[PDB]
Design an enzyme around this catalytic site. Structure first.
Site, PDB file in Angstrom:
ATOM      1  N   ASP B  25       0.799  -1.205   0.000  1.00 41.64           N
ATOM      2  CA  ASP B  25       0.000   0.000   0.000  1.00 41.64           C
ATOM      3  C   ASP B  25       0.839   1.265   0.000  1.00 41.64           C
ATOM      4  O   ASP B  25       1.383   1.674   1.009  1.00 41.64           O
ATOM      5  CB  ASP B  25      -0.880  -0.149   1.234  1.00 41.64           C
ATOM      6  N   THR B  26       0.870   1.943  -1.138  1.00 42.19           N
ATOM      7  CA  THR B  26       1.638   3.190  -1.176  1.00 42.19           C
ATOM      8  C   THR B  26       1.058   4.362  -0.411  1.00 42.19           C
ATOM      9  O   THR B  26       1.696   5.376  -0.206  1.00 42.19           O
ATOM     10  CB  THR B  26       1.828   3.607  -2.635  1.00 42.19           C
ATOM     11  N   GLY B  27      -0.204   4.206  -0.019  1.00 36.88           N
ATOM     12  CA  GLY B  27      -0.801   5.297   0.733  1.00 36.88           C
ATOM     13  C   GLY B  27      -0.370   5.311   2.171  1.00 36.88           C
ATOM     14  O   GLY B  27      -0.360   6.329   2.837  1.00 36.88           O
TER      15      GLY B  27
HETATM   16  O1  LIG Z   1       0.464   5.137   8.863  1.00 41.68           O
HETATM   17  C1  LIG Z   1      -0.749   5.252   8.919  1.00 41.68           C
HETATM   18  N1  LIG Z   1      -1.332   6.185   9.698  1.00 41.68           N
HETATM   19  C2  LIG Z   1      -0.649   7.104  10.653  1.00 41.68           C
HETATM   20  N2  LIG Z   1      -1.286   7.900  11.547  1.00 41.68           N
HETATM   21  C3  LIG Z   1      -0.433   8.659  12.329  1.00 41.68           C
HETATM   22  C4  LIG Z   1       0.942   8.485  12.074  1.00 41.68           C
HETATM   23  S1  LIG Z   1       1.016   7.344  10.838  1.00 41.68           S
HETATM   24  C5  LIG Z   1      -1.683   4.323   8.176  1.00 41.68           C
HETATM   25  C6  LIG Z   1      -1.275   2.985   8.024  1.00 41.68           C
HETATM   26  C7  LIG Z   1      -2.113   2.032   7.421  1.00 41.68           C
HETATM   27  C8  LIG Z   1      -3.381   2.423   6.958  1.00 41.68           C
HETATM   28  C9  LIG Z   1      -3.818   3.756   7.085  1.00 41.68           C
HETATM   29  C10 LIG Z   1      -5.217   4.139   6.608  1.00 41.68           C
HETATM   30  N3  LIG Z   1      -5.631   3.774   5.238  1.00 41.68           N
HETATM   31  C11 LIG Z   1      -6.846   3.182   5.048  1.00 41.68           C
HETATM   32  O2  LIG Z   1      -7.596   3.068   6.007  1.00 41.68           O
HETATM   33  N4  LIG Z   1      -7.285   2.725   3.842  1.00 41.68           N
HETATM   34  C12 LIG Z   1      -8.740   2.730   3.555  1.00 41.68           C
HETATM   35  C13 LIG Z   1      -8.996   2.902   2.043  1.00 41.68           C
HETATM   36  C14 LIG Z   1     -10.469   3.127   1.672  1.00 41.68           C
HETATM   37  C15 LIG Z   1      -9.481   4.308   1.683  1.00 41.68           C
HETATM   38  C16 LIG Z   1      -6.415   2.018   2.887  1.00 41.68           C
HETATM   39  C17 LIG Z   1      -5.889   0.717   3.536  1.00 41.68           C
HETATM   40  C18 LIG Z   1      -6.979  -0.293   3.807  1.00 41.68           C
HETATM   41  C19 LIG Z   1      -7.518  -1.036   2.728  1.00 41.68           C
HETATM   42  C20 LIG Z   1      -8.575  -1.933   2.949  1.00 41.68           C
HETATM   43  C21 LIG Z   1      -9.093  -2.095   4.250  1.00 41.68           C
HETATM   44  C22 LIG Z   1      -8.548  -1.359   5.328  1.00 41.68           C
HETATM   45  C23 LIG Z   1      -7.484  -0.455   5.112  1.00 41.68           C
HETATM   46  C24 LIG Z   1      -5.387   2.851   2.163  1.00 41.68           C
HETATM   47  O3  LIG Z   1      -4.918   2.029   1.117  1.00 41.68           O
HETATM   48  C25 LIG Z   1      -4.276   3.243   3.105  1.00 41.68           C
HETATM   49  O4  LIG Z   1      -3.221   3.873   2.412  1.00 41.68           O
HETATM   50  C26 LIG Z   1      -4.747   4.243   4.154  1.00 41.68           C
HETATM   51  C27 LIG Z   1      -5.277   5.588   3.625  1.00 41.68           C
HETATM   52  C28 LIG Z   1      -4.904   6.746   4.518  1.00 41.68           C
HETATM   53  C29 LIG Z   1      -3.539   7.099   4.656  1.00 41.68           C
HETATM   54  C30 LIG Z   1      -3.172   8.168   5.494  1.00 41.68           C
HETATM   55  C31 LIG Z   1      -4.168   8.884   6.188  1.00 41.68           C
HETATM   56  C32 LIG Z   1      -5.529   8.538   6.047  1.00 41.68           C
HETATM   57  C33 LIG Z   1      -5.901   7.464   5.206  1.00 41.68           C
HETATM   58  C34 LIG Z   1      -2.959   4.716   7.695  1.00 41.68           C
END
Ligand SMILES: O=C(Nc1nccs1)c1cccc(CN2C(=O)N(CC3CC3)[C@H](Cc3ccccc3)[C@H](O)[C@@H](O)[C@H]2Cc2ccccc2)c1
Lengths: 99, 99
Positions: B25-27
């Site tokens: 996951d690049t996000g």
């Molecule tokens: O490091 C992180 N956070 C921190 N906080 C404080 C310090 S670091 C962090 C780590 C892992 C997941 C996430 C949250 N995250 C997510 O929830 N999603 C839902 C998709 C629908 C949009 C996808 C992953 C996913 C896929 C399927 C099921 C569950 C999760 C998506 O691909 C993924 O990149 C991100 C999108 C996102 C990134 C950053 C901020 C908000 C959102 C954040």
């Protein structure tokens, strides 16, 4: 033109006449952008992630211009903290992950 | 290898003896894994996602074989629905996002 994941891979969208930055998110199935208006109508869907579940409004057939690539797909607008471009559009600009 | 995002970028990982598969996951910034018995000491932490925040155990110096390559990093273990490899590790394998 390629991008290393040392930074958050942000690029600029143009959607609906507006300019925003957005996260390229290979782990997301769908594209969810923040709250802003978009011409057309929608229905609810409900999406989730880590954290749980938000309620978003979905519009199909939306043009987005990413960099200067045009794509047409669903977008979901709702309370996301971050604008996210997910695989549904990512496939249209032809984005690969190479390693 | 190259992954096209027409399907989930799922990849095989071995962490701490255990075989799992995880989403590239690049996000995501950090890597977060479902509850797993990794060796011992951690800091307590919370991360933000869509929906809300979750609360995770931050283990550091975890070695993982990702695909068939390896990296050492921090992993966050906590109740995620899906296992996320995030950029803190993606950079160590040199994964590029590419268009
Ligand atoms: O490091 C992180 N956070 C921190 N906080 C404080 C310090 S670091 C962090 C780590 C892992 C997941 C996430 C949250 N995250 C997510 O929830 N999603 C839902 C998709 C629908 C949009 C996808 C992953 C996913 C896929 C399927 C099921 C569950 C999760 C998506 O691909 C993924 O990149 C991100 C999108 C996102 C990134 C950053 C901020 C908000 C959102 C954040």
């Amino acid at each position: 033109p390629q991008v290393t994941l040392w930074q958050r891979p942000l690029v600029t969208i143009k959607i609906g006449g507006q300019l925003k930055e957005a996260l390229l998110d290979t782990g997301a199935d769908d594209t969810v952008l923040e709250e802003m208006s978009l011409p057309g109508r929608w229905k609810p869907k409900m999406i989730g992630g880590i954290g749980g579940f938000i309620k978003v409004r979905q519009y199909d057939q939306i043009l987005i211009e990413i960099c200067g690539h045009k794509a047409i797909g669903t977008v979901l607008v709702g309370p996301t903290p971050v604008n996210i471009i997910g695989r549904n559009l990512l496939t249209q600009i032809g984005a690969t992950l190479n390693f």
